[PDB]
């Protein structure tokens, strides 16, 4: 398995007829492991902001979750494990692994639940592989 294969075939594949708009596997230092064509470049402090929220859940919500300069409202996630964001009919799921981040960005008609499922299920599988 390449990381590009995990992105192309396991994150960017169909789920219930829908597809993520973009996806990435990113080291917690901010190093891209692999990403899709339209996944944005992270801006400064963005990865740091994400990790601080995993470390202290609730830190990010007041100011918002930023990815590629796009602001998402933080909605309910899983403390220290999953960050979820909403932006109108779109949003994002960030799933923490031991040393990486699995990220999916969706837009209508794809649902939050579909994005959560495809992103979080791969994260759990990669965690059990020691990643």
Domains defined along the chain, listed by start: 1-131 (3.30.450.30)
CA angle 40, 44, 75 (to 5 degrees): 65
The rounded distance, in Å, linking the Cα atoms of 82 and 86 is 14
The rounded distance, in Å, linking the Cα atoms of 116 and 96 is 12
Q: Coil, strand or helix: which one is 102? A: strand
Any idea of the CA torsion for 42, 43, 48, 49, to the nearest 10 degrees? -100
**DSSP 8-state code for residue 39:** P
Please give the structure tokens belonging to residue 65: 């979750």
Could you tell me which residues come within 8 angstroms of residue 119 by beta carbon, excluding any fewer than 6 positions away? 11, 20, 23, 93, 94, 95, 102, 103, 104
The rounded distance, in Å, linking the Cα atoms of 92 and 115 is 7
Report the 10 Å Cβ neighbour count for 56.
11
CA angle 63, 69, 71 (to 5 degrees): 40
Burial 61-73 (b: 16+ CB within 10 A, else e): eeeebbbeebebe
Q: Measured over all CA atoms, what is the biggest interatomic distance in the chain, rounded to whole angstroms?
A: 39
Q: Using the structure block, give the residue that is written with the tokens 């009919």.
A: 89
Could you tell me which residues come within 8 angstroms of residue 68 by beta carbon, excluding any fewer than 6 positions away? 40, 41, 42, 43, 46
């Amino acid at each position: 398995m390449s990381w590009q294969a995990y992105v192309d075939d396991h994150l960017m594949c169909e789920i219930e007829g829908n597809h993520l708009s973009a996806a990435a596997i990113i080291g917690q230092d901010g190093s891209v492991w692999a990403q899709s064509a339209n996944f944005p470049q992270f801006k400064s402090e963005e990865i740091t902001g994400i990790m601080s929220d995993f470390h202290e859940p609730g830190t990010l919500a007041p100011t918002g979750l930023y990815i590629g300069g796009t602001k998402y409202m933080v909605i309910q996630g899983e403390p220290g494990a999953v960050i979820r964001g909403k932006k109108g009919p779109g949003g994002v799921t960030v799933k923490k692994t031991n040393q990486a981040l699995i990220i999916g960005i969706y837009d209508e008609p794809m649902t939050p639940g579909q994005c959560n499922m495809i992103v979080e299920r791969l994260g759990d599988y990669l965690i059990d592989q020691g990643y």
